[PDB]
Structure 1
Amino acid sequence: TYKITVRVYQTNPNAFFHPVEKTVWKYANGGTWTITDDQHVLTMGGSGTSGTLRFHADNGESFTATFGVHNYKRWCDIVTNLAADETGMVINQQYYSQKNREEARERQLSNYEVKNAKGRNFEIVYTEAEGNDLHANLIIG
């Protein structure tokens, strides 16, 4: 099994984001999202699956942060500028069907950042980036 423990950092007082969806993809015997000490903990049955957290702010901004393991190496991606019909479960499935998402997963990134249309930065950084007990920061700008 693989575990990814996620700590969320919010740095900008002009918004407040909160989790509104948490999904687990069906490969590698699935998995579970739970909470321990205010951290989001994804446990997966083996290498080859992932889970997505969707966040929403009062001002209408939203994004997904997806975490997984591909051929025993961690990966992550952020999708911003979400339309109302781009829920977390829609995005999570796309990592195994849609070319640009698949390629993001295949990059096996220990860190990734992107800006939305409003210019806000979002970053994931794995602070424990190897082995079966993985830890990442999600930093919202």
Structure 2
Amino acid sequence: TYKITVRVYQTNPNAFFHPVEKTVWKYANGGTWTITDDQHVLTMGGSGTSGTLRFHADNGESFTATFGVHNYKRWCDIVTNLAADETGMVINQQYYSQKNREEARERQLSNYEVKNAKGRNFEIVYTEAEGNDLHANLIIG
């Protein structure tokens, strides 16, 4: 099995985001999201699956942060500027169906950042990027 422990950092008091969805994809015997010590913990049955966290702010901004294991290495991706019909479960499935999202996963990134239309930065960084017990920060700008 693989475990990914996520710590969320909010750095900019001009907005406040909260988690509104937590999904788990069906490959590699699936998995489970839980919370321990204010950390989001994803456990997976093997290499080849993932889970998505969707966040929303009161001002309308939202994004997905997805974490998983591809070919025995960690991966991550962030999607911003979400339409109302782009929920976390939609985004999670797209990593296994939609070519551009598939490629984002196959890159096996231990770090990724991107801005939304308003210019806000979002970053995922793995502070423990090796082995089966993986650790990442999600930093909101």
TM-score, shorter chain, exceeding 0.5 = yes
Separation in 2 of the partners of 1:99 and 1:80?
Answer: 18
**Post-superposition offset of 1:96:** 0.3
Separation in 2 of the partners of 1:78 and 1:7?
Answer: 15
Separation in 2 of the partners of 1:57 and 1:41?
Answer: 22
The C-alpha deviation readout for 1:3-49, integer Å capped at 9, x for no partner, is: 00000000000000000000000000000000000000000000000
Separation in 2 of the partners of 1:111 and 1:61?
Answer: 22
The C-alpha deviation readout for 1:83-136, integer Å capped at 9, x for no partner, is: 000000000000001111000000000000000000000000000000000000
**TM-score normalized by the length of structure 2:** 1.00
The C-alpha deviation readout for 1:55-101, integer Å capped at 9, x for no partner, is: 00000000000000000000000000000000000000000011110
Aligned length: 141
Task: Report % sequence identity.
Answer: 100
Secondary structure of residue in 2 paired with 1:124? strand
> Structure 1 stretches of 5 or more lacking a match?
none
Secondary structure of residue in 2 paired with 1:86? coil
Separation in 1 of the partners of 2:35 and 2:85?
Answer: 26
Within-5 A mapping of 1:39-118 = 39-118=39-118
Separation in 1 of the partners of 2:132 and 2:85?
Answer: 33
Secondary structure of residue in 1 paired with 2:105? helix
* Structure 2 counterpart of 1:24: 24
Secondary structure of residue in 2 paired with 1:89? helix
